[PDB]
Subunit: 266 residues, 4 copies
Amino acid sequence: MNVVIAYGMPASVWRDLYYWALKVSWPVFFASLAALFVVNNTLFALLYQLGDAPIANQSPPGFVGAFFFSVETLATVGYGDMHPQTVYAHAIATLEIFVGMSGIALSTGLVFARFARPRAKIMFARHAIVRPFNGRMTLMVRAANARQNVIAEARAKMRLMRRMKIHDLKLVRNEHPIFLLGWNMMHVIDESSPLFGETPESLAEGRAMLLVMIEGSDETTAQVMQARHAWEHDDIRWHHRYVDLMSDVDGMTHIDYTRFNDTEPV
Amino acid sequence: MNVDVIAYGMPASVWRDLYYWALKVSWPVFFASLAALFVVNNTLFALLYQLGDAPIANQSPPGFVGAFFFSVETLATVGYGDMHPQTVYAHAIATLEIFVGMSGIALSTGLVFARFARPRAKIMFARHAIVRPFNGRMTLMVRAANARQNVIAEARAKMRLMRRRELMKLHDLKLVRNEHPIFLLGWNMMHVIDESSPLFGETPESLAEGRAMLLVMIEGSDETTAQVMQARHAWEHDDIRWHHRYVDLMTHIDYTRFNDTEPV
Amino acid sequence: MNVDVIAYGMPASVWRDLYYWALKVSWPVFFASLAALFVVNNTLFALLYQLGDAPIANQSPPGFVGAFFFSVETLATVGYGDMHPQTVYAHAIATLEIFVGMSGIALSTGLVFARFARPRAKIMFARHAIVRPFNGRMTLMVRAANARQNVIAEARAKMRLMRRRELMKLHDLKLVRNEHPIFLLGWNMMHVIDESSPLFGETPESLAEGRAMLLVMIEGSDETTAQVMQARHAWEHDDIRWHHRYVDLMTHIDYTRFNDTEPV
Amino acid sequence: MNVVIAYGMPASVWRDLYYWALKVSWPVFFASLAALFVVNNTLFALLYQLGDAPIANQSPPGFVGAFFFSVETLATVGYGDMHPQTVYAHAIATLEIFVGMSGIALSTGLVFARFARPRAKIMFARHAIVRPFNGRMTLMVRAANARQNVIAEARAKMRLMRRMKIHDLKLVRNEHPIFLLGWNMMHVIDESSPLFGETPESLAEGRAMLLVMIEGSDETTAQVMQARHAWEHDDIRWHHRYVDLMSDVDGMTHIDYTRFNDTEPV
Ligand SMILES: [K+]
Ligand SMILES: [K+]
Ligand SMILES: [Mg+2]
Ligand SMILES: [Mg+2]
Ligand SMILES: [Mg+2]
Ligand SMILES: [Mg+2]
Ligand SMILES: [Mg+2]
């Protein structure tokens, strides 16, 4: 196809910062660096004014000159129009360089660290269904590859949480070969099923919860991406079916996602 | 917890799509693209410079072309120094252009490695599959082999069948061998079509009738990067040749005759 | 195929050992180390400069200190230009110093990210394990929980036993549950000591006699980087408390009382 | 613990170059870049001499000056002592910059690409053994973590190749919890074993070969590193045993590898 309150576990402001460094959006990433870039120069520019006769030909003479020189020395561009006169000028200048490169290095580190973030995301049907299939009462939930990055050859595990014990639900099929389109995961509610004999009311009574999870590899980076979804009992629709998301035209069949989490009683 | 075919209807943000091409594109095209992006980036600042008169000291050649060739100076952090921001505004732009430039380099480099990271070892499959009498029973075979310079040995495989039923039921075809130790040469994967086989009793015509499809998939690790590379192939029913055999490539092996067969 | 305790007696090349510390070391120490490596690197070239007289034009302060502060100029590709290689030799050094410098930056950056790459999510185990009557039978339990900011949910675990036999036989203790869906809080891993259990009929004294040891291991993926992080823990027999229970941390949970127990 | 001739499969000189870029040793890596660095300037320096009056203050006047300016413009250091006079001077200069950065970028890419190479290596005993253990005739081979980087919690698969069919040999233990020391892998040669009833001579007759393979993760990078070893039939020693590689002193037991692949008949 084309197109709770933790208490006692030590947290560090450091790690939290990194977390946002990755969760944040691109535009916000740089703007943040900018606001961090300016701040970094302001700091050295001031550090320069401390000693008089800092940079030769410091223009515009004053703080603004010491600033626009900072940006020069920090990025290793070094025009040379300015030049450390006094020893102290150098001492600062030199220390500012070590900072600058480390500056670049860390940013670049983050920049790639962000690229590394897995790409292929997997959408689940906001609603799950229980419907008579091939004679017996089965349960189904469908998911499908959602980003440009493909996951084919994906395997899945389906669970149940209720009053709090955790039950495994045997899937009719555990792995899916050509996931590149969509997947309709389903679990038969026969004698062995932990769900056997459980009316919609019987679920609520025990605060039931359905947990699915699909793992698979991004064929493009080898990164093994996993994704997870949870349904509340009031999110399972009884005796419903998934609106078919796959038309056909000119002998060519396509698949419309526009109506992905939509259902219709049987 | 806190301390104390084709698809339609997809998202598809322009950003992500751009990155995708940044990786799918070929090397030459990668850089040329940057070039065309590099020029564009300077043109933009050069213009931004002309806005204020007396921008760069000794701006030669005096005019737009000078402001351009200065841009390339300030953006790459090379900074000859022949030019120099005179007016405050000159600096304001210059300084903002630097932050951009480095970020420029950083992103490119990020992409550059992001491309290196792409898994390397590719696995070719025989454009044609076969069903032939082997050791008494009617078995099915398809062969694949490591294709790039990067090796995959110790590779495991899963073989599937897709047909229409009463929906496209996906069946697991039991392979005679699931894993292959020394894959460094080639692999002849095969599935016996006995009583248990979902393919048992199915004439070539019987396949078409249900739009049958064979899906194989081989996973294994690139011993050189540890990257676990997977590859996949699909055969249509008219791509299975009946009562055929794979021409023995082979001490010399002629991978040219890889997907070639001969009736028994 | 071509087209057409402590250990002794180990290899341990100095290079690899250096890299190991490059990653084990703490951030502050990382840079300071580079600094001390940065200075050293210039001192070396500055001296290399003094060898030939009339090295850098306008070398200020005239003397070694000038040749130093020029080094830092030429090594970081900042190149103010106040100084300039006069003599040919000046250039020869200067040019060779540049190749070094960039390689300098490149390697550092390489390390810098190589450190970022280090898996983040860490998993703490209860310093003490317990054996207690649960649901009728004598079972054994140990609990662990996600410890860093980075989450591991959907984690699976393997539990082992090491004792001396007639060699240190390694036995697999069947866990009541092998995988845990929502690990985002905590996990209470437990193994029933019935007839099949290799621990069946073994008094606390019976353990020591054979130098018993409990080895657990939890694997799971950091949902944020896809990196599959594993963690491991070992208990000595005197670290198992008999007929005890884990103090319920818990809506608030006090992870401070994590490895605390109370007899039943 | 502390301390064949392929014919028809397309190869590209490109890919082959990268392969060496990673297989090569560090010193050789850079020297190679150097020799590649010089070459790169020589090329532009010449490209400069084509047009007269290339770089202002081109010292030493001549080719050597155009060279030492190249190194200036290529590394984005740009002293500024030299400066493109003629338009052509710039045209070259500008094109040389785009190259230079791409230069750095690719090198850095390689530099990290090398760091990424898995680290933890796993040594196998050059010799394997078949010895009476606990009554029955079993076969053993030992391996142990070899680099500074640890693999614990390692699993292994053992195979047999003979006249050419490939047999799986059931290991007494498939996975090893605390691999941080050493591992003695062993396969009982009872009725079910494909090796049952096979004298050392019986092996050779069919060109037997033993293939082991251990996979496990580097707890430090999450990289799942695998390693592989092969024994010829004349590399299996019969009725031998592995010299014990684990002494004890002061109540503290250590492990000497100095005698790792050494054996002694029973
Ligand atoms: K300069
Ligand atoms: K400069
Ligand atoms: Mg520079
Ligand atoms: Mg001036
Ligand atoms: Mg002039
Ligand atoms: Mg002066
Ligand atoms: Mg001069």
